[PDB]
């Protein structure tokens, strides 16, 4: 037969604009196509994007940034009023730390 096997020919690609000039690129059926576009646009831009950004922008401060600022203001006021240094090089009281007896 001078051939190697029985096979279908490779078909040409289908253009969705031929049977649907306004085809949205979702499906060959115009109605399912239009509703796929509508649901994508409504649930992607309207619901998730804008409302999610609004929700994230107004998330309550669980990182305690404002609380930390107020605490720092209190401590700075107190230590400046009573003349103590603003910070200490030791974050732990040496009275509760027991160094080894002998260093030699």
């Amino acid at each position: 037969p001078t051939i190697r096997l029985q096979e279908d020919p490779d078909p040409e690609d289908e253009n969705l604009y031929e049977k649907n000039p306004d085809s949205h690129g979702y499906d060959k059926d115009p109605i399912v196509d239009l509703w796929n576009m509508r649901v994508v646009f409504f649930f992607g831009f309207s619901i998730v994007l804008v409302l999610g950004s609004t929700f994230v922008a107004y998330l309550p401060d669980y990182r305690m940034q404002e609380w930390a600022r107020r605490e720092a203001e209190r401590l700075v006021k107190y230590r400046e009023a009573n003349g103590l240094p603003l910070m200490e090089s030791n974050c732990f009281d040496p009275n509760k730390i027991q160094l080894p007896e002998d260093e030699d």
Binding site: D13, N15, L16, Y17, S23, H24, G25, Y26, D27, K28, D29, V32, W35, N36, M37, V39, V40, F41, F43, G44, F45, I47, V48, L49, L51, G52, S53, F55, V56, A57, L59, P60, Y62, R63, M64, Q65
Partner: protein, 459 residues
């Protein structure tokens, strides 16, 4: 956190019980709803994580990754329905099932409290990806790619398993919280060196590290568009997440065990950025771009500073979004002309102006233009590296130039010049592709508006 896990397991039978022409609509709608649900995990604390149960927890490092995964699933669904139109209903449902199973495994991986459970899920992610690549890839190289994708992973991960169980026979627990609190220094012995290597090599090969990256071009080129999206944007970040997690038990060995990997990362970042300059394949260029960015992330994780961790987290998020957008942009042209050569279809700005705008924005974000989160991550990593050693500003600086070049190179090759005369099958851009581009690009700048959401726990 079962309020997120269960709806995906419900996406499974909803897809398998859907009418033959309504699978895509239902899947996309409910995946978008699941992403909206997962948006609530961004409300993190400043001290500890969200310990939902004995099995699952959420942290400031894993919540952006979970949001990115749940947001990426619908994008894959939209990007896949074009080239799968002629498929049968059962095979379409199988493809959607693979995607859903991959999302479920990734969601459980990013929140596991246990290192063996993390290993099991982080290894289970291979089967759907391998099936997708080797079944729905287009050319005959895909089979080889699958093999390259498989064993490269497994040869790195099987030693890790051994190390993991060894640790559990020494400390008695592999729970991450107990591991963090009961941490002890690693001595300098050969056994500790090999334990370090076993704990590190799996995540270093999943990054991938330079020299161990040969699987990535194959896997990201022969895969379908959804496969490339998930491989580049999420599956590469498993290595980064795992290294950030596992490095808590490797100090102070890392202090000197990072030198070969730091050297490889920097020089191979330069090397892959240079490789991008001479690439006839447009998908391979994006793959090597991913390699360079992940080399930067490797450096950031290896130098072990708070600024480096912040920059690394931001860079992973930004790279995921950007690389997914670039792959989709390349796939549009591929679907139009059925070829991956970059110099085949030229001057496309004349024919597709809005697509050219999308290309310009994607390329501008790829080269880390301020104040994009790509730049924020890159600059934080560069500052941390400068603190590590002043000479690094040379190599990093070199990369900053080369990236820009190849980035604009791609644009100038594909959008400018004159159109090819014999190519006359370039139809106007569909609404689906424009929506895909917009849903990729708008979150990037929206996160630029509020950058502390992707800066990780060290913020």
């Amino acid at each position: 956190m079962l309020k997120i896990i269960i709806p995906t397991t419900m996406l499974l039978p909803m897809t398998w019980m859907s009418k033959h022409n309504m699978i895509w609509i239902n899947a996309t709608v409910h995946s978008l709803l699941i992403s909206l649900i997962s948006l609530s995990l961004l409300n993190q604390l400043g001290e500890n994580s969200l310990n939902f149960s004995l099995t699952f927890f959420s942290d400031s490092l894993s919540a952006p990754l979970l949001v990115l995964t749940t947001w990426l699933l619908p994008l894959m669904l939209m990007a896949s329905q074009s080239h799968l139109s002629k498929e049968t209903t059962t095979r379409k449902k199988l493809y959607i099932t693979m995607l859903i199973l991959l999302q479920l495994f990734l969601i459980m991986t990013f929140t596991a409290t246990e290192l063996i459970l993390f290993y099991i899920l982080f290894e289970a992610t291979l089967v759907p990806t391998l099936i997708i690549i080797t079944r729905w890839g287009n050319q005959t190289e895909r089979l080889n790619a699958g093999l390259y994708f498989l064993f490269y992973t497994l040869a790195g991960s099987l030693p890790l398993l051994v190390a993991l169980v060894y640790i559990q026979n020494t400390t008695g627990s592999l729970n991450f919280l107990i591991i963090h609190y009961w941490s002890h220094p690693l001595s300098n012995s050969w056994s500790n060196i090999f334990m370090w290597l076993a704990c590190i090599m799996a995540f270093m090969v999943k990054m991938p590290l330079y020299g161990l990256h040969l699987w990535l071009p194959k896997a990201h080129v022969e895969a379908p568009i959804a496969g490339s999206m998930v491989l580049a944007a999420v599956l590469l970040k498993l290595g980064g997440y795992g290294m950030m997690r596992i490095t808590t038990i490797l100090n102070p060995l890392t202090n000197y065990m990072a030198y070969p990997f730091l050297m490889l990362s920097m020089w191979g970042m330069i090397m892959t950025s240079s490789i991008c300059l001479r690439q006839t394949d447009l998908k391979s260029l994006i793959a090597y771009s991913s390699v360079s960015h992940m080399a930067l992330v490797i450096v950031a994780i290896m130098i072990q500073t708070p600024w480096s961790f912040m920059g690394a987290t931001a860079l992973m998020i930004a790279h995921g979004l950007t690389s997914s957008m670039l792959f989709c942009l390349a796939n549009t042209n591929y679907e139009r002309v059925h070829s991956r050569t970059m110099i085949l279809a030229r001057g496309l700005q004349t024919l597709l102006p809005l697509m050219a705008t999308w290309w310009l924005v994607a390329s501008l974000t790829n080269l880390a233009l301020p104040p994009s989160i790509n730049l924020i991550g890159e600059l934080f990593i560069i500052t941390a590296s400068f603190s590590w050693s002043n000479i690094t500003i040379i190599l990093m600086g070199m990369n900053m130039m080369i990236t820009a070049l190849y980035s604009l190179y791609m644009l100038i090759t594909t959008q400018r010049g004159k159109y090819t005369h014999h190519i006359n099958n370039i139809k106007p851009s569909f609404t689906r592709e424009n929506a895909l581009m917009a849903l990729h690009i708008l979150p990037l700048l929206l996160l630029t508006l509020n950058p502390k959401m992707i800066l990780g726990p060290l913020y």
